[PDB]
């Protein structure tokens, strides 16, 4: 019924929010690994 | 209420497929990115 619907919306838009914190924060990684690895890059040298 | 309600909720399932899209394809990035420091960090004898 009503409530069962009002309830799933309610789920999805948790878990919407979940993957986009999700996907914030793996991108927020992303952005230090490539500073990473370009440090890296540097130490080794040319390639 | 109820029709309109389901229409919300096939929006909102859309969001949050993309972003975990969005996660999916970071993390995905993160694990190349892992490796590559794995390697570089081997060669040049880092922790």
Redesign the interface.
């Known amino acids: 019924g009503?409530d069962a619907?009002?309830k799933?919306?309610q789920m999805?838009?948790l878990?919407?929010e979940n993957?986009?914190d999700?996907?914030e924060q793996?991108?927020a990684?992303?952005y230090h690994?490539?500073n990473?690895?370009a440090r890296?890059?540097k130490?080794?040298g040319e390639r």
Do not use: P, T
């Open positions: 009503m619907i009002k799933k919306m999805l838009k878990d919407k993957a986009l999700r996907a793996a991108e990684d992303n690994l490539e990473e690895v890296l890059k130490l080794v």
